[PDB]
Design a protein around this nucleic acid. Structure first.
Ligand SMILES: [Mg+2]
Ligand SMILES: [Mg+2]
Ligand SMILES: [Mg+2]
Ligand SMILES: [Mg+2]
Ligand SMILES: [Mg+2]
Ligand SMILES: [Mg+2]
Lengths: 51, 109, 236, 225, 63, 128, 125
RNA sequence: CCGUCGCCGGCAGUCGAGAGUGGACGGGAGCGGCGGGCCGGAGCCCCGCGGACGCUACGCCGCGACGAGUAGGAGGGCCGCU
RNA sequence: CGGGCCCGGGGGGCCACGCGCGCGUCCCGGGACGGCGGAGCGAGCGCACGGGGUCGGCGGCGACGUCGGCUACCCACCCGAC
């Protein structure tokens, strides 16, 4: 079987290359996307109260 | 009717002091003299239109004797206007200080 | 068949996690334990040609070439052009005025209709204003201005696919040597179907151009650069 | 004969899938554990500093122990004692970072190379981004891109490092098998620093680059890899 | 540029017999196959001794 | 209508000019074909800027387009008809070439044999 | 032996043509005409060759006997197939695949025999 | 992309039937999942008779690092002359 | 917003938690937790940030004037060059 050269892809930019090396990176990512949308919705409630 | 391209000067090639790299040209577009003012032009098609002796074919007409070398504006060069441009074949040095058209094709507006 | 039951946060990441989606699918109770034609027979042409013929379709080739080319590896992307996702520039909403930059109708001011399936923009100039008929035009050869006409409550006919506007071909059935010059088919003629779809759309776009003042003369002029204006300083 | 040889073939492909999903769950939970352990470390430095400011006292942190050296000066006209030290750090070419373990043996030979290297104390983001973007391995003296965890696990696996996340924890929390993990990495190949060097030939604390900029080396790594 | 030395890169070593003896070249093909497809290090010793010069391969007496 | 090669890659030459010998312009006694400049002060040998380039191994062409004619084929030189049939099974990657010595009577027979044997001939108009 | 004879005729042979960066070979029972150990019509205990017929109709399939390896007057048995193009190929395919007679020269015998029939078709201008 | 060096790298498995991180049996005792009338068990390919290329083994294929040079050394020359 | 798989006992979020019997430990007959026990494989669809590019996308032009190709052909300019 010929093993040719695998093109090195950037896991810092390519998501499924990151998940092949770190499967936990998906769980951090869904926790930080949801946490940033929960804090952002919580700061447009402070702005929509003092107005 | 109307001009419909923006007029630019071929200044020179991308160069050091004692070396020049003829594959990249340097253009001065009239009207823009700051690097923040040049983001409009960064993908735009550009042409060097000139005339020669023999007739060549014209796409969309009878054989003229105008010929075109096509290029693209790729990046900015410096702090005052001055984009640099990559042409399909390198510009002849006869063109230095003549007109290069900048075209408004591919648009982002 | 149900929907996906797992909304997307961003592309390639679902919202609900792995064990959370075990229980939204009720997989705790929904689990499972364990478990041509190539030849035909074709009848006799007898008598005493006895027995039917077994004949295969897909016969074996009469001529192999001298050499062949090895087949490719596999790619995991790389869809055909019919399956590309179409993008539309955010400046362009249905009803905007476009400045055509490229064709025979350079400089014209046309009004943007529906976007077609292959990404091309179905545009009309009102033919009574600037002689651009219902055409396609390309997205990146077009400047979107900021002027808008409400094309809501305007009925575009649904037989206006990409196949409606695609050019026609004839040449060249049964002709092998060039002596007989043929001055036919290089003239394009407007069909009656093409000519009344224009009238169906101009009939209901024009009352909204005559609504706002002096948009007509704007849509009759052509765009140009003069000794003043530079396009990075213009506002479109 | 023939039907029994499918069923022995389909059951050995079944054990390999069960073994594969067990190993994916191990490296998942090892990385969830390391995420907790980095919060343990990062929050503790804040709490130890706050409880000293309450009592009117000072908290001196631990003297750091992971450094990241970078050769900044090229290979022309280098004195021989300096030239031998740079090839013990595996800095054979310009812009060729590596991790070193700080102790008195390694600090006194980083002082020999003061004007050739720039170094300091990297943080967790810098050791993540160098391993993922630019980490290659020395696998029977070849330089192999770390595109899969089986490359790490076939070499460092007898030390407990079986995925790229374990390797990052072994470098950053300078563990008992730091030596084998660091030597597994082919030394890094960084580009030219984007935005300039600000006078390469002189020391950092007098306006240049050489020597120990201490945690500002992280600001250099971002614009260099 | 890198700071390495190149004078010992090419390591001097036989990798075929220098003779054109066709019976010797023919059992080099046998033992080169046996050295590849086998874990035996006997065949890897016998292969390289077939490569050697006559003076690196002396006569063994019967006694 | 000509015979087509098997595949036709884009042939990229790393250099299209020849390597002329240093100072072959200044003399008739110096021919243009290359000799390596062995001389203690030679500015070609020492590779100054703006001088004649010296041939080296980095200019070597991609070795799947090497010796390829500009129409996809590779050249094989033939003398008579019976050594034309070694190209019978090299049909779509090698083309025959009748050598210069072959007379007018005999290179008729090479041309029509190769036409009925699907072999492209590079000079099939040579005594006509 | 086929290997021992090959070490003689590998570089020194009257059938061997070495011209510009390529080598050919002109011995009779050689498919592909390449100088190779697998394709060599003289050294193996069993060979296959295909040639055009006496006149320009058909192909002559010649195979090699088991028995008389040192008897060149009777070592080869020659068969003329003059079928259509499709069934002369399934004939050569059966002479190699069904007898297991040297079944590595199989498709090289089909590429040659198909190309030797296309040579016999009447040329059109 | 070209070359060199290294991997004492790979390819004689042209094995479309080759297939093993051990296999067989052969009785002693048993399970599940199969055919229920609680009794019982091998498919040796084929409706297709068929399935690219290769391996001048001094060949072919892969992977990684590397490339200044006088004097001088050494190799290759399908460079040339009689 | 310390640690103890956020020790444990009682009274909205998250989980890469999810067969039964049989033993184990623990907790309050009941549980929870097991890395423990002698017994064979789920199947089919899709989608893809996944072992290096494709289109199942398109247009124009053409024999006595144009198309492409050319270098030890000539000339021109820029840069380099004793
Ligand atoms: Mg004009
Ligand atoms: Mg210096
Ligand atoms: Mg050297
Ligand atoms: Mg000197
Ligand atoms: Mg050298
Ligand atoms: Mg010398």
């Amino acid at each position: 079987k010929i093993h040719r050269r695998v093109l090195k892809k950037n896991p810092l930019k390519n998501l499924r290359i990151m998940l092949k090396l770190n499967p936990y990176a998906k769980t951090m990512r869904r926790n930080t996307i949801l946490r940033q949308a929960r804090n952002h919705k919580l700061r447009v409630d402070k702005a929509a109260a003092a107005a | 009717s109307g001009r419909l391209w923006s007029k630019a000067i071929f200044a020179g090639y991308k160069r050091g002091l004692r070396n020049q790299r003829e594959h990249t040209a340097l253009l001065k577009i009239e009207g823009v003299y700051a690097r923040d003012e040049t983001e409009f032009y960064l993908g735009k098609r550009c042409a060097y239109v000139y005339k020669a002796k023999n007739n060549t074919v014209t796409p969309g007409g009878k054989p003229n004797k105008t010929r075109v070398i096509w290029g693209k504006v790729t990046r900015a060069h410096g702090n005052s206007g001055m984009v640099r441009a990559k042409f399909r074949s390198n510009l002849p040095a006869k063109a230095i200080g003549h007109r290069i058209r900048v075209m408004l094709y591919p648009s982002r507006i | 068949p149900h929907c996906s039951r797992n909304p997307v946060l961003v592309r390639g990441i679902g919202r609900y996690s792995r064990s959370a989606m075990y229980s939204r699918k009720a997989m705790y109770k929904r689990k499972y334990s364990a478990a041509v034609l190539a030849t035909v027979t074709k009848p006799v042409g007898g008598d005493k040609n006895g027995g039917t013929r077994v004949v295969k379709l897909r016969k074996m080739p009469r001529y192999y070439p001298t050499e062949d080319v090895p087949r490719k590896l596999l790619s995991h992307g790389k869809k055909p052009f019919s399956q590309h996702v179409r993008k539309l520039r955010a400046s362009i909403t249905p009803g905007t005025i476009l400045i055509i930059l490229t064709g025979r109708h350079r400089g014209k001011r046309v009004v943007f209709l529906k976007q077609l399936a292959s990404g091309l923009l179905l545009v009309t100039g009102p033919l009574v204003l600037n002689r651009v008929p219902l055409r396609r035009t390309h997205q990146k050869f077009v400047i979107a201005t900021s002027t808008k006409i409400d094309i809501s409550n305007v009925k575009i006919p649904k037989h206006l696919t990409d196949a409606y506007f695609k050019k026609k071909k004839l040449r060249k059935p049964r002709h092998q040597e060039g002596e007989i010059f043929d001055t036919e088919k290089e003239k394009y003629e407007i069909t009656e179907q093409r000519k009344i779809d224009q009238k169906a759309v101009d009939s209901q776009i024009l009352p909204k151009i005559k609504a706002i003042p002096q948009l007509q003369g704007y849509l009759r002029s052509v765009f140009a650069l003069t000794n003043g204006i530079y396009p990075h300083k213009l506002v479109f | 004969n023939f039907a029994e040889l499918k069923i022995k073939r389909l059951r050995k492909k079944f054990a390999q899938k069960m073994l594969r999903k067990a190993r994916r769950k191990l490296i998942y939970e090892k990385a969830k554990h390391y995420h907790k352990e980095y919060r343990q470390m990062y929050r503790t430095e804040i709490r130890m500093a706050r409880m000293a400011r309450k009592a009117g006292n000072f908290y001196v942190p631990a003297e750091p122990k992971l450094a990241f050296v970078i050769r900044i000066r090229g290979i022309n006209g280098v004195s021989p004692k300096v030239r031998k030290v740079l090839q013990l750090l595996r800095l054979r070419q310009i812009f060729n970072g590596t991790f070193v373990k700080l102790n008195k043996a390694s600090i006194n030979m980083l002082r020999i190379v003061e004007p050739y290297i720039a170094w300091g104390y990297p943080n967790l983001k810098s050791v993540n981004e160098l391993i993922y973007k630019r980490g290659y391995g020395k696998i029977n003296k070849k330089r192999i891109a770390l595109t899969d965890n089986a490359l790490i696990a076939r070499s460092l696996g007898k030390y407990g490092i079986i995925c790229m996340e374990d390797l990052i924890h072994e470098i950053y929390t300078v563990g008992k098998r730091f030596k084998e993990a660091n030597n597994f990495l082919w030394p890094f190949k960084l580009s030219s620093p984007r935005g300039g060097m600000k006078k390469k030939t002189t020391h950092f604390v007098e306006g240049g680059d050489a020597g120990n900029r201490e945690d500002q080396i992280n600001r250099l790594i971002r614009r260099m890899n | 540029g890198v700071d390495i030395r190149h004078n010992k890169d090419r390591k001097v070593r036989r990798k075929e017999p220098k003779s054109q003896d066709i019976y010797l070249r023919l059992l080099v093909k046998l033992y080169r196959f046996l050295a590849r497809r086998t874990n035996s290090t006997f065949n890897q010793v016998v292969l390289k001794r077939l490569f050697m010069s006559r003076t690196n391969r002396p006569p063994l007496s019967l006694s | 209508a000509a015979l087509r090669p098997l595949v036709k890659p884009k042939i990229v030459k790393k250099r299209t000019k020849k390597f002329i010998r240093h100072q072959s312009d200044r003399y008739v006694k110096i021919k243009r074909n290359w000799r390596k400049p062995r001389g203690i002060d030679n500015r070609v040998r020492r590779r100054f800027k703006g001088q004649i380039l010296m041939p080296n191994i980095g200019y070597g062409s991609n070795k799947k387009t090497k010796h390829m004619l500009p129409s996809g084929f590779r050249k094989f030189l033939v003398h008579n008809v019976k050594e034309l049939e070694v190209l019978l099974m090299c049909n779509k990657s090698y083309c025959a070439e009748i050598a210069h010595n072959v007379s007018s009577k005999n290179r008729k027979a090479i041309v029509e044999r190769a036409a009925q044997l699907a072999i492209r001939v590079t000079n099939p108009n040579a005594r006509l | 032996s086929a290997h021992l004879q090959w070490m003689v005729v590998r570089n020194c042979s009257s059938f061997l043509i070495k011209r510009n960066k390529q080598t050919y070979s002109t011995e009779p029972n050689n498919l592909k005409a390449r100088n190779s150990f697998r394709y060599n019509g003289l050294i193996h205990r069993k060979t296959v060759g295909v040639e055009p017929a006496a006149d320009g109709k058909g192909v002559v399939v010649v195979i090699k006997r088991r028995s008389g390896q040192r008897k060149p007057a009777t070592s080869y048995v020659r068969t003329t197939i003059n079928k259509n193009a499709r069934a002369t190929l399934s004939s050569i395919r059966h002479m190699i695949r069904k007898n297991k007679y040297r079944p590595d020269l199989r498709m090289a015998a089909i590429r040659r025999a198909s190309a030797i029939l296309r040579s016999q078709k009447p040329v059109m201008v």
